[PDB]
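Complex 105.
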Amino acid sequence: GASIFRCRQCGQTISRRDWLLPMGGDHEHVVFNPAGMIFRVWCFSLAQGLRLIGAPSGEFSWFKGYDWTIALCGQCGSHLGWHYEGGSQPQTFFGLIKDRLAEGP
Ligand SMILES: [Zn+2]
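Predicted structure with zinc ion bound:
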Protein backbone atom coordinates (compact mmCIF):
# COMPACT_ATOMS: atom_id res chain seq x y z
CA GLY A 1 0.00 0.00 0.00
CA ALA A 2 2.85 2.48 0.87
CA SER A 3 6.08 0.74 -0.27
CA ILE A 4 7.50 3.29 -2.86
CA PHE A 5 9.14 6.68 -2.12
CA ARG A 6 8.88 9.17 -5.04
CA CYS A 7 10.32 12.71 -5.40
CA ARG A 8 7.59 14.92 -3.77
CA GLN A 9 8.23 17.67 -6.40
CA CYS A 10 8.08 15.56 -9.65
CA GLY A 11 7.01 11.93 -8.71
CA GLN A 12 10.38 10.44 -9.83
CA THR A 13 10.71 6.91 -8.31
CA ILE A 14 13.57 7.03 -5.70
CA SER A 15 13.38 4.09 -3.18
CA ARG A 16 11.18 1.53 -1.32
CA ARG A 17 10.08 1.11 2.35
CA ASP A 18 11.80 -2.35 2.14
CA TRP A 19 15.17 -0.53 1.56
CA LEU A 20 14.93 1.43 4.86
CA LEU A 21 18.17 0.99 6.87
CA PRO A 22 18.23 1.33 10.72
CA MET A 23 21.76 2.98 10.92
CA GLY A 24 22.97 3.05 14.59
CA GLY A 25 19.53 1.92 15.92
CA ASP A 26 16.81 3.95 14.04
CA HIS A 27 16.27 4.76 10.31
CA GLU A 28 15.26 8.39 11.23
CA HIS A 29 18.28 10.67 11.99
CA VAL A 30 17.55 14.34 12.86
CA VAL A 31 20.74 16.27 11.91
CA PHE A 32 21.67 19.95 11.28
CA ASN A 33 24.15 21.20 8.59
CA PRO A 34 26.65 24.08 9.24
CA ALA A 35 23.96 26.47 7.82
CA GLY A 36 21.90 25.24 10.85
CA MET A 37 19.20 23.69 8.60
CA ILE A 38 17.67 20.68 10.42
CA PHE A 39 16.82 17.57 8.31
CA ARG A 40 14.83 14.47 9.26
CA VAL A 41 17.06 12.02 7.27
CA TRP A 42 15.87 8.45 6.43
CA CYS A 43 18.73 6.03 5.59
CA PHE A 44 18.20 3.69 2.57
CA SER A 45 20.43 0.75 1.54
CA LEU A 46 19.44 1.51 -2.11
CA ALA A 47 17.94 4.39 -4.16
CA GLN A 48 17.44 5.20 -7.90
CA GLY A 49 16.48 8.15 -10.18
CA LEU A 50 19.02 10.36 -8.31
CA ARG A 51 21.90 12.43 -9.77
CA LEU A 52 25.04 12.44 -7.53
CA ILE A 53 26.91 15.77 -8.13
CA GLY A 54 30.14 17.25 -6.69
CA ALA A 55 33.09 15.29 -5.24
CA PRO A 56 32.72 13.06 -2.12
CA SER A 57 33.45 15.16 1.03
CA GLY A 58 34.22 13.98 4.60
CA GLU A 59 33.79 17.61 5.83
CA PHE A 60 30.76 17.83 8.22
CA SER A 61 29.71 14.16 7.50
CA TRP A 62 26.99 13.29 10.09
CA PHE A 63 28.08 9.60 9.94
CA LYS A 64 31.58 8.64 11.30
CA GLY A 65 33.80 7.22 8.52
CA TYR A 66 31.53 8.19 5.56
CA ASP A 67 32.11 10.72 2.76
CA TRP A 68 28.97 12.25 1.16
CA THR A 69 28.12 13.54 -2.34
CA ILE A 70 24.96 15.62 -3.00
CA ALA A 71 21.98 13.53 -4.25
CA LEU A 72 19.64 15.52 -6.59
CA CYS A 73 16.39 14.19 -8.09
CA GLY A 74 17.53 13.02 -11.58
CA GLN A 75 14.20 14.37 -12.93
CA CYS A 76 13.67 17.87 -11.38
CA GLY A 77 17.09 18.49 -9.68
CA SER A 78 15.48 18.99 -6.21
CA HIS A 79 18.03 18.26 -3.41
CA LEU A 80 16.78 14.92 -1.93
CA GLY A 81 19.82 14.19 0.32
CA TRP A 82 23.25 12.54 0.07
CA HIS A 83 25.04 9.36 -0.99
CA TYR A 84 27.41 8.11 1.77
CA GLU A 85 30.52 6.02 0.92
CA GLY A 86 34.07 5.21 2.23
CA GLY A 87 32.61 3.59 5.42
CA SER A 88 32.14 0.01 6.73
CA GLN A 89 29.01 -2.09 7.57
CA PRO A 90 27.93 -0.91 5.12
CA GLN A 91 30.46 0.78 2.75
CA THR A 92 27.66 2.93 1.13
CA PHE A 93 24.05 4.12 1.82
CA PHE A 94 21.69 7.06 1.10
CA GLY A 95 20.51 9.73 3.55
CA LEU A 96 17.26 11.10 2.03
CA ILE A 97 15.27 14.06 3.44
CA LYS A 98 11.89 12.56 4.58
CA ASP A 99 9.86 15.76 3.78
CA ARG A 100 11.11 15.87 0.10
CA LEU A 101 9.80 12.31 -0.61
CA ALA A 102 6.17 11.08 -1.06
CA GLU A 103 5.33 7.49 0.07
CA GLY A 104 2.72 5.40 -1.83
CA PRO A 105 1.95 2.14 -3.71
ZN1 LIG B 1 12.02 15.56 -8.50
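Strands lie at 4-7, 13-16, 28-32, 38-44, 50-57, 67-73, 79-85, 93-97, 101-104.
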